[PDB]
Design a protein around this ligand. Structure first.
Ligand SMILES: Clc1ccc(C2(c3ccc(-c4cn[nH]c4)cc3)CCNCC2)cc1
Lengths: 337, 20
């Protein structure tokens, strides 16, 4: 029963939600190895934990930059939520801490790299390939939404492939716990639902829209709405017109028509039967949802690895100092972190 | 082709999040 697992899952989440773990490690417990990517106010590095020899992904945020970009509440959201959740297809926090200048979030390291890198290289996925990944996103969103969490940044850039070829959703900078509607203009242009673009209050339905964009991009090799500038893209999103490649199966087209539905009363995930509309759709008929959660299904692509701490599935970025001021920055703003 | 238009576009790389 999906109902029973989710009931326990919520009991587990609330306890950590109301009493967040805090200051569970320190910088010099970690050997910094390599940068796996960059963000506006920080970055993510491969590091090794000296005590265990375990490798981890460490998100390093510059407190001053966080404040400048008005991402204080959002970053508190990220840490508070990540420390509380636990699901196979999410990178949850193993440790978090802060020092004078930076915030730090340590999560399980995914050696396979981003879906983005592989999708772009190979061009496009087969429908079974794309269905294997979609199922894991369907289940994660089921989990998150039951906890009153909206994710708000689904894209291949945020999906890491693990050693078994399964996905981990990562980067929760825009994730929020909200009952009812919210108004923040956030996310990535290609993946924004029309509600967001038209400055309406919206809810978790925007995640199901973004699932529709992902599945399309995975199966097509490009997104359903693209252009050179964001404003050309929003023009296309609101218009309510998507063209599917001729190789798209009839079942896939029908699924996507129902995910990429501007009409909220008609959009799958947002209806009275919730996620089952998606789960019991014909395109997923072959999917064994339990086997997928248990990781019993054979992944259509297993990443190349040569020992632990291997980074050949990630791009090269310029390595930069982590400087720790002798003076505490932004102590009040990040007191609860 | 749509593929060719995509590949020729300025948005085949890592896409950044928006804000206000
Ligand atoms: Cl600040 C920041 C945010 C996100 C990343 C990315 C990232 C890379 C790796 C991991 C990671 C987590 N666990 N294993 C790898 C998370 C996020 C995801 C978005 N594309 C660039 C890389 C890097 C830096």
């Amino acid at each position: 029963s999906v109902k029973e697992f989710l009931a326990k899952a919520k009991e587990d989440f609330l306890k950590k939600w109301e009493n967040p773990a805090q200051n569970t490690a320190h910088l010099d417990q970690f050997e910094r190895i390599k940068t796996l990517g960059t963000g506006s106010f920080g970055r993510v590095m491969l590091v090794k934990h000296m005590e265990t020899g375990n490798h981890y992904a460490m998100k390093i945020l510059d407190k001053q930059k966080v404040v400048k970009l008005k991402q204080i509440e959002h970053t508190l959201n990220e840490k508070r939520i990540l420390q509380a959740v636990n699901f196979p297809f999410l990178t949850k926090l193993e440790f978090s801490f802060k020092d004078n200048s930076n915030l730090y979030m340590v999560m399980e390291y995914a050696p396979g790299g981003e879906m983005f890198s592989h999708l772009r290289r190979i061009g496009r996925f087969s429908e079974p390939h794309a269905r294997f990944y979609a199922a894991q996103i369907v289940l994660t969103f089921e989990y998150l939404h039951s906890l009153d969490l909206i994710y708000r940044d689904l894209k291949p850039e945020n999906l890491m492939i693990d050693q078994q070829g399964y996905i981990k959703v990562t980067d929760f900078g825009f994730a929020k716990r909200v009952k009812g509607r919210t108004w923040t203009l956030c996310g990535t242009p290609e993946y924004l639902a029309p509600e967001i673009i038209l400055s309406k209050g919206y809810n978790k339905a925007v995640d199901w829209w973004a699932l529709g964009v992902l599945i399309y991009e995975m199966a097509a090799g490009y997104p359903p709405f693209f252009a050179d500038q964001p404003i050309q893209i929003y023009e296309k999103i609101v218009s309510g017109k998507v063209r599917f490649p001729s190789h798209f199966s009839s079942d896939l087209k029908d699924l996507l028509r129902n995910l990429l539905q501007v009409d909220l009363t008609k959009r799958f995930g947002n209806l009275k039967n919730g996620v089952n509309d998606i789960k019991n759709h014909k395109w997923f008929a072959t999917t064994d949802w339990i086997a997928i959660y248990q990781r019993k299904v054979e992944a259509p692509f297993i990443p190349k690895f040569k020992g632990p701490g291997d980074t050949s599935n990630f791009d090269d970025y310029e390595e930069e100092e982590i400087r720790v001021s002798i003076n505490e920055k932004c102590g009040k703003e990040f007191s609860e972190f | 082709t749509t593929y060719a238009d995509f590949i020729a576009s300025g948005r085949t790389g890592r896409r950044n999040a928006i804000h206000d």
